Swiss-Prot record, chain A:
Annotated effect of mutating H68G: Loss of DTX3L-mediated polyubiquitination of histone H3 and H4
Effect of S65E: Phosphomimetic mutant that binds and activates PRKN
Protein name (database record): Ubiquitin
Site location (Interacts with activating enzyme): R54, R72
Effect of K48R: No effect on HLTF-mediated polyubiquitination of PCNA
Interval of the full protein contained in this chain: 1 to 76 of 229
Amino acid sequence: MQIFVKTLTGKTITLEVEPSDTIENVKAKIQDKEGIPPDQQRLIFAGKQLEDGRTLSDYNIQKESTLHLVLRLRGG
Amino acid sequence: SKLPYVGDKEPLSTLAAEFQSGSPILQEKIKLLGEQYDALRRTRGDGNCFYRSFMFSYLEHILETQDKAEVERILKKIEQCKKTLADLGYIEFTFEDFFSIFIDQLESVLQGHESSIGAEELLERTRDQMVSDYVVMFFRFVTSGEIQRRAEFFEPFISGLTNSTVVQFCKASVEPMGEESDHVHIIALSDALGVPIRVMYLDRSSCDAGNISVNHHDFSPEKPYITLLYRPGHYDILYPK
């Protein structure tokens, strides 16, 4: 299935996944398309951050759902 | 505790000394950074390092470039930010001194007039609490205005990051001095002022082990003329070769 990831610049990345894909797998797909190391990605679905262990069905991310991506840039 | 808000320029070797009994990925990335960058300048770990780095980087860029047209441009953006703060319900009494102090520094680094300053005095002012903290606070207000002006766009990012509304985030995480910044702050400040930023990301990340490089993130509202070093938790200033 296809999902969409919105970024803070207003861009949408479209990805091909299945409900049994890891969050790690999705971040690896995002690296494939954008070159962002998965270590530096934070993925959000509906106000909750997605954990690397769980998968798309655990967060009930269905067909053509939209995730949000933020980079890990917290710093003092 | 005893350290200045902004340090002197330092060779990149001082960075490698911080990691020479840590991870080899990091040592190799610092080697490559030395290939691409002459020096770094540290900022104090008081929670303000992104804004402090940006402030000094930008003021020094104007000092060395003498780019009066860039100054005219940014002054127009700053006027617009004053207007959006007013439209959001902030009265001038709450922020005017922050704007006027920063504008004074900006005009001071331009040469050829009564109150022109050089690099040593610029470092003095960015090391002085009653100037440096006020300029940081200026940047935080600008950031907060841009985030609230675009509340609807930033909302899902912020609620995933913090389980806060956009206004709660601005009040609790953008405006207070000493609050760490993250991706939303950088996007908002870069867009509100229209100045680009390159962030070199120094971490242990790798995709092909034995093929390691320092990746970066560009904020481009044409290589950015502001380059920052990011390590997890902290921002510093980088100088290109």
